[PDB]
């Protein structure tokens, strides 16, 4: 039997209490939605592996207990665990399978305690682990009505007791206990544990709520990799797929003859050091098996090659140097080691890649009266470079005279031979040492390991391996020409490209397994919870030749573009505006198609229109909307102050005294985060402190009808702060800071309070309504806002005469924005975006610093402390100056992001100051500068790292067609507008500015002549009054 | 705009060894924020292209009947015969522009993303700014497009540099020619020079030598025996294999932070370039700039944008 | 490394070990030059600004 | 092109026909790897030898330079043939 288990298998990863903190944990959890065993138990009248999760609703207990272990025939130590009435008993013994065990011959361990358990049959769940010999229990008790087995709920398993077993478990079994031996029915369930990564809610008492499984689909895998609960709507790029290769196909060249290395092992005389013997061996089969199958070694030693994997590793050539050694010199042989027989006899290269094998020789080379047959020489000229012969047996000059002819004084020919015995040999009897030297993976390799070839597969991602270069990949027919002599391929990356077929001579093509990025493609977690997957730049043929999660691949909805496969969305032919961009114009949206689901279309670019142009048409509005739009701008981030010495190692005076010496990089580091925090001052202070003195709103706040009680500041509240001003201060979110301030990093306060911020924006204020642009330039010169209003329109080349014309509609349409932008400011969170995000950024990076100090660095632990409790001085400084280099790295990576942040920062601040200096302090002509429109004024509002302008602009509207003419011919002479520009009713002609219809009579004042109409295209003809 | 990149941890640091798959999860931290900081970069380029050519609310289209008082616009508003919705000079843009290596940086898991907007999407935007520009002026930057003779336009461009309108009227056919010969001798210098798109090639060229850089840092040693994993695991038991895969771990993620490092510099200049250009689509095509010599030499009358790979090209129109 | 001067390395180390505390000051100095080139490189930036 | 480094002699060689016009014309080759043998012997001098024939008298040419530890630029054709050096 089977069934499925929902929410199943969650238990507390560790004794530690935390409180509203998502934590990611990667451990043996029971995947959710599993196929676990429903198990039932009748008489008649399991493998343990990776951890097991076990669940009984029973009463009255059948299950009386279980038993654990390898083997459960003696063979190895078991494990039981049995329950009665009163108590349980836990033993660990030599259990020879009390009916259950015949006798305990060897018993190591026993446990007694409290017992572990506590139509209404309700749940008993246990998890069993087995890590480090370390055995551990997790329970929890639920009473349910019994519905059905396994019900939708949530709960963790408290841990129990864990006992320090320290023995072998592969298999479990439950026992079947009777009180005759009567027939009875029984049923529990059954769920294997994975290596899973969960993510756990934790409420405020600490309880894990709720969870998540990051490993099971898409929506999950976004949810785990943004650490929420909670995804906005968009597209997340999650962990990479990659086609997993289906078989393993190995090429070695057909060689069968075995290499005769048992031969230089077992020679009945070995050349003597001086004249040591090497010989290539090649094109035949080697093993490391058979050379202590003939005879037992003393002492393996090599370098970069382990002993294990030699065999399935191909040999270019090898060469094999086998000599007798006395006893105590056997250490003398290792690269860089100096001595006589090193400097005088044979020494080898520093980097020498190769095994040696050395045993004792006593029995075969000692002799009782003295062996007097192995000589060595410990004279010559100099000393003798890697792999070189010295045999001439000539006398040496050791002595300060020319030693000539047969010998000299004080002057000796190569040393008399060792009078070797075999009794007097204690410690100091010869032995033989074989040395195995290489080189592998440069040239054709002749000689292989025992391991036989496979056969060749072709169009399909295998482990192929070819004389021990392994990779995994597609092979394929080669276009390119390899020479006989050549081998392998390589690329610009130093990476194989092509290959020789060490059987048939063949080349063949190396293409690594087709992968690329999984993107997931969801709406509001809270409006849906189908999602899209793209793979990226992938054929969508090959997808469904990848059918970890599955669920999707069944197509059925697969659409193809440039940036990739999708599947989960349905291609529609019609544009909509595009929220969530998929790449190579495609995006993604959730709507109806009445069912809601996930679709892909090409983006639209807006509404298709064609402007109504003619010979001699224009558009001439005769309307006009007072647009108030916000413009959020960062002017300055959190000024932060960091030391090393309490970051990179808190109260460690070793630690302190190895760090001094990077006193230049800390002060290089302290002289960075000083310069950013004094250009934040700077930034604030440029943009804001723009005014010498201080102004004062009068308390008579009469301005022809507009209302500026939402911007000027209100007395009544402490902080001398407006309505928006208020709003926007509310609208940002400014504990994890105490952890940051503890771990040595702090933050400096702005030289500029708040206060004094809204201060300074405040004066702005009341210099703009009160003096116009004039406080900007000298001396502030008071002006009405009426005619300051006029002159503003005077400069979009709007003729004042509009303004005190339409003066209350005017001052109603200023209201009714402010008041737009006080409601979407009050309704939405997404006004304040880039303030927001800012924060964010500085808290994220800060967030991101602190969590690097759990990060080892190679090191056995991260903390400093325990590394040096665990280690001896050297190893704790060879570990902590590591550690600290690491940490080091980790800070200049910071100050080094800080200073681009800065960089961004700063210009963002000097558009900022750019923009209080034109917009705020005057009027601007550059278009789109100062907000949509021709613009009138701006406003600025103080907010949390930045400043908010209320960009007040013109915006034209309710046009109308009229017939125009470049020009008019009255007297056979042209004339033209003076400003402004002729159109026609149908019948008379009117000069009119050119962004408010106005018509007025064609005289002399408004036009001036030039030339005659014969040479302008397009004049037309009527009067012009005197 | 650059070229948006994307990189994997695993397939570059660690090509596809589960061994050094869970040596690397231990510095899980150094790559989320890569990734983070990669994507930002992208995030940005497809802003960057939004804020410099998405400035239209609507799609405009040229009239059929081309007639703009002599001013002969055919070498760059689109021609329908082409597939590429494209215009000459857009088209000689593209052909001047060059974009084997790209397999080996796939293969190595430096992939690059797809612009959200194609080349046919930002041409019609181009060609959206062209007939607004021609048939409406600047007016279309403020509020509604509202339509006028090119004939007016270009007197009240002559107005704005303090040149009487009279005086291009009167001279109507003459301006009309001179602006033809000197698309004339764009399309003549475009086409005989390969010097003429430095910035955009030379960009393009920063961005392949970066990730060619970054593809030949896998042949440093950076201390090991070797460059590659897969011999140090076939030749290696953990105890040591795992030294030595830690020490070219920390070498390849210092390559790739000095990568993303090198990337957001580059990034933040070319983000410098869109504003400048954003703030020239704002000021020299949606209206008359009065900033000296900063829509071209002279006397500036107006502009033309003109898509080209990953830039954008002004035709400052100029009174001199 | 055991000293700041290579030429004591060289004088008081036989090659392998002088070139394992020499690859480790050459990647010590290495990251002090691509430190100051990317602090150039972000100064060079304010200053074409 | 003969060379013995660490007791290990390695040999290159090619044969290149060329015409009448006179010795060492701009032609451009490279010499494909023959045999390694390991000689593991000091070496500081060499000699070619001749063979006759009696000792008819006659003339004969060749040509030696001496390697010289050297950075080069090897250039690979579509073949993998190195086509120019620098
Ligand atoms: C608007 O301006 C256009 C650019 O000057 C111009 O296009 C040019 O038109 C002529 C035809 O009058 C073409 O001349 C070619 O004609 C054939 C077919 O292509 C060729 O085999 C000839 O060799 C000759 O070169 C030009 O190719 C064409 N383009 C260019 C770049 O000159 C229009 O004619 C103008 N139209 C109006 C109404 O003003
Ligand atoms: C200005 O008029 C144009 C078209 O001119 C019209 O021509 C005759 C048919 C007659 O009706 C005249 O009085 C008109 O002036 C308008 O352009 C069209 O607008 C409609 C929407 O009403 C649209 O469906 C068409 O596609 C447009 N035609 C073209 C060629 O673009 C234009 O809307 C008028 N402008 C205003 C502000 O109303
Ligand atoms: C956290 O635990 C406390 C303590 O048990 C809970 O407080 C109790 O809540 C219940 C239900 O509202 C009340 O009947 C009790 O009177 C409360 N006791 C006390 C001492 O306050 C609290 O509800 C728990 N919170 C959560 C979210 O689980
Ligand atoms: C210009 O547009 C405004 C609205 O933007 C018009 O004002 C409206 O006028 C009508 C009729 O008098 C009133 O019912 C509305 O209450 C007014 N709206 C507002 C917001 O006050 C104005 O009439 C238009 N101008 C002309 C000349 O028609
Ligand atoms: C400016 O607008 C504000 C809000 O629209 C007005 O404030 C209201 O004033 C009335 C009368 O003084 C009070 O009864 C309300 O409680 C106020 N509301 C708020 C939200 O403050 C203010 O009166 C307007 N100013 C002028 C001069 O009309
Ligand atoms: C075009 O505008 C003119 C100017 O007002 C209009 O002419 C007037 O029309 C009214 C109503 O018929 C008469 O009372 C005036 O005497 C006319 N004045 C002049 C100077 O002619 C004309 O009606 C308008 N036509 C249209 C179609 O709007
Ligand atoms: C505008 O009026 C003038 C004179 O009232 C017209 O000029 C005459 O045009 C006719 C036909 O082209 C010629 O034969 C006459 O010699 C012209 N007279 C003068 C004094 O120049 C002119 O044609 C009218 N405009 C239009 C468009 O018809
Ligand atoms: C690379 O090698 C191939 C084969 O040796 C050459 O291919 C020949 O090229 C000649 C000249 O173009 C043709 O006449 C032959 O028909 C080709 N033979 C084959 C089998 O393809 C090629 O030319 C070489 N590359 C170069 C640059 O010379
Ligand atoms: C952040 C956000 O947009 N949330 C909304 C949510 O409030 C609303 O209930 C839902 C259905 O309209 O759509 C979504
Ligand atoms: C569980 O797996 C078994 C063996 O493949 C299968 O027979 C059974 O149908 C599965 N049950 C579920 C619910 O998947
Ligand atoms: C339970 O078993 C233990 C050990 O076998 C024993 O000491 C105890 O007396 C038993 N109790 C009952 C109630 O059976
Ligand atoms: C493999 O065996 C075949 C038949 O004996 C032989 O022709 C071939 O040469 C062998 N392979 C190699 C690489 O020599
Ligand atoms: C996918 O492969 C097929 C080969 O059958 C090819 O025709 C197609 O163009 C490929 N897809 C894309 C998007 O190039
Ligand atoms: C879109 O239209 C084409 C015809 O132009 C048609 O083949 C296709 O089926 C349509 N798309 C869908 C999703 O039906
Ligand atoms: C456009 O204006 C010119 C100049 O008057 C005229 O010759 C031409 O006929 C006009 N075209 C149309 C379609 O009215
Ligand atoms: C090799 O021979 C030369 C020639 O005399 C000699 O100087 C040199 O010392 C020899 N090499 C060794 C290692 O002795």
Request: with cysteine; hydrophobic share 35%.
């Given at each position: 039997?089977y ?20 934590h990611s944990?990667?451990?043996?959890f ?25 669940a009984?609703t ?27 009435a ?42 069993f ?18 519905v059905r087995?396994?019900?939708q ?5 408290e841990?129990?007791?864990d006992?320090?077993?320290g023995?072998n ?30 993510l ?11 969870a998540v ?50 031969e230089?092992?077992?020679?009945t ?19 490391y ?12 030693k ?7 994997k ?10 094999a140097?086998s ?10 042989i290792?690269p ?8 005088y ?25 003295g ?28 002595g ?14 190569p ?8 009794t ?16 592998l ?21 295998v482990?192929?391996?070819?004389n ?28 194989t ?9 063949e ?6 397994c087709s992968?690329?990025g ?16 793209l ?18 691949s069944t197509?059925?909805?697969?659409f ?10 349905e291609?529609?032919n ?5 929220d969530?961009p998929?790449?190579?114009?495609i ?15 090409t ?17 001439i ?15 300055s ?7 090393c ?19 230049s ?26 005014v010498?003195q201080?102004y ?15 911007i ?6 402490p ?10 201060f509310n ?5 994890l800071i ?10 400096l306060?702005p ?7 809204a ?6 204020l009341?210099?703009?309504?009160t ?7 000298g ?51 997404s ?16 967030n ?30 060879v570990?902590?100056?590591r ?9 200049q ?11 961004e ?7 900022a100051?750019?923009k209080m200096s034109?917009?705020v302090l005057?009027?601007s ?5 100062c ?10 509002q103080?907010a949390?790292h930045?400043?908010?302008?209320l ?7 309710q ?7 470049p ?11 003076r400003e ?30 030039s030339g ?14 005197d």
């Open positions: 039997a069934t499925n288990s929902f929410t199943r298998g969650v238990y507390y990863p560790d004794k530690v209490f935390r409180s509203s903190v998502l944990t990667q451990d043996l029971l995947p959710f939605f599993s196929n676990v065993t429903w198990f039932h138990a009748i008489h008649v009248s399991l493998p343990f592996n990776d951890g097991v999760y076990f009984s029973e009463k009255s207990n059948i299950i009386r207990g279980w038993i654990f272990g390898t083997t459960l025939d003696s063979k190895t130590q078991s494990l039981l665990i049995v329950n009665n009163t108590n349980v008993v836990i033993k660990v013994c030599e259990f020879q399978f009390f009916r259950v065990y015949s006798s305990a011959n060897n018993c190591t361990f026993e446990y007694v305690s409290q017992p572990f358990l506590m139509n209404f049959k309700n749940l008993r769940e246990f998890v682990k087995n890590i480090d010999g370390y055995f551990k229990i997790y329970s929890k008790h639920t009473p349910i009505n019994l087995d396994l019900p709920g949530f709960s963790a398993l841990p129990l007791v006992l320090p077993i023995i478990i592969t298999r479990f079994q439950t026992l079947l206990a009777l009180h005759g031996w009567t027939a009875g029915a029984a049923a529990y369930y059954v769920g294997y544990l994975q290596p899973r990564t969960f756990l809610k934790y409420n405020e008492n600490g309880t894990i709520t709720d499984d990051c490993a099971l689909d898409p929506l999950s895998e976004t949810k785990c990799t943004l650490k929420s609960f909670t995804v906005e709507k968009g597209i997340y790029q999650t962990s990479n797929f990659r086609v997993q290769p289906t078989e393993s196909i190995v090429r070695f060249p057909n060689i069968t003859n075995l290499c005769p290395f048992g230089v092992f077992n020679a005389r070995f050349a003597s050091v001086y004249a040591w013997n090497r010989k290539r061996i090649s094109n035949c089969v080697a093993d098996s058979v050379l202590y199958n003939s005879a037992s070694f003393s002492t393996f090599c370098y970069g090659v382990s002993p294990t030699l065999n399935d590793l191909c040999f270019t050539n090898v060469y140097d000599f007798v050694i006395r006893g105590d010199e056997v250490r003398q290792a860089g080691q100096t001595g006589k027989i090193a400097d006899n044979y020494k080898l290269p520093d980097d020498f890649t190769g095994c040696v094998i050395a045993w004792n020789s006593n029995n075969l080379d000692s002799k009782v009266g062996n007097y047959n192995y000589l060595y020489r410990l004279f010559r000229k100099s000393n003798l470079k890697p792999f070189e012969r010295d045999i001439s047996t000539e006398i040496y000059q050791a300060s005279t020319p030693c000539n002819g047969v010998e000299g004084f004080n002057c000796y020919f040393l008399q031979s060792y009078g070797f015995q075999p007097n040999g204690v410690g100091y009897q010869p032995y033989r040492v074989v040395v195995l030297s290489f080189e993976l440069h040239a054709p390799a002749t000689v292989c390991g025992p391991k036989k070839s496979t056969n060749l597969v072709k169009n399909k991602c482990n192929f391996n070819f021990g270069l392994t990779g995994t990949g597609v092979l394929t027919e080669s276009n390119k020409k390899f020479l006989p002599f050549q081998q392998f391929g390589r690329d610009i990356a130093d990476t490209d092509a290959v020789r077929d060490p059987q048939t001579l080349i063949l093509d190396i293409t690594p992968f690329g999984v993107s997931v493609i969801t709406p509001g977690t809270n409006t849906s919870n189908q999602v899209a997957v793979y990226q730049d992938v054929n969508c043929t090959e997808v469904p030749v990848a059918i970890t999660w599955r669920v999707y197509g059925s909805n697969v193809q573009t440039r940036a990739g496969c999708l599947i989960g969305a291609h529609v019609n544009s909509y505006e595009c969530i998929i790449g190579a114009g995006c993604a949206s959730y709507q109806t198609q009445a069912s809601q689901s996930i679709i892909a279309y983006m639209s670019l807006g509404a298709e229109n064609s402007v109504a142009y003619s010979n001699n048409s224009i558009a509005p005769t309307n006009f909307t007072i647009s108030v739009t916000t413009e959020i701008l960062p002017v981030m959190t000024k932060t102050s960091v030391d010495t309490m970051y990179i190692c808190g109260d460690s005076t070793e630690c302190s005294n190895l760090l001094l010496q990077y006193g990089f800390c002060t290089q580091l302290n002289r960075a985060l000083t310069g950013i925090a004094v250009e934040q001052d700077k930034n604030t202070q440029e943009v804001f402190a723009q010498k201080i004062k709103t009068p308390p008579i706040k009469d301005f022809g009808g507009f209302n500026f009680s939402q000027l500041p209100d007395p009544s509240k902080s001398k702060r407006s309505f928006i001003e208020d709003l926007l609208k940002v979110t400014l504990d105490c952890a940051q301030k503890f771990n040595g990093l702090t933050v306060p030289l500029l309070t708040d206060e004094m911020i201060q300074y924006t405040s004066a702005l009341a210099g703009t309504i003096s116009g642009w004039t406080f900007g330039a001396a502030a010169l008071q002006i009405p806002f009426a005619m300051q209003m006029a002159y503003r329109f005077n400069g979009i080349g709007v003729t004042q005469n509009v303004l005190y014309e339409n003066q209350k509609l005017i001052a109603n349409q200023f209201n009714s924005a402010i008041g737009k932008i006080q409601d979407s400011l009050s309704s939405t969170a006004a304040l975006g880039k303030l927001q995000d800012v924060v964010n950024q500085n808290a994220q990076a800060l991101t610093l602190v969590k690097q100090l759990s990060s080892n660095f190679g090191a056995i632990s991260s903390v400093l402390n325990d590394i040096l409790s665990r280690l001896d001085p050297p190893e704790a400084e570990q902590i100056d550690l600290i280099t690491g940490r080091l790295q980790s800070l990576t910071y100050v080094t992001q800080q200073l681009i942040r800065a960089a920062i700063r210009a963002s601040a000097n558009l100051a750019t034109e917009c005057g009027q002509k550059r278009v789109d500068f907000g949509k429109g021709y613009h009138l004024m701006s406003f600025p103080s949390p930045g400043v908010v302008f960009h007040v602009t013109y915006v034209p509207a046009e109308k067609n009229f017939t125009t003419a020009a008019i011919c009255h007297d056979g002479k042209a004339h033209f507008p402004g520009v002729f159109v026609s009713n149908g019948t008379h002609w009117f000069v009119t500015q050119r962004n408010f219809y106005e018509p007025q009579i064609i005289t002399t004042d408004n036009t001036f002549v005659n109409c014969d040479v302008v295209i397009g004049i037309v003809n009527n009067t012009v009054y």
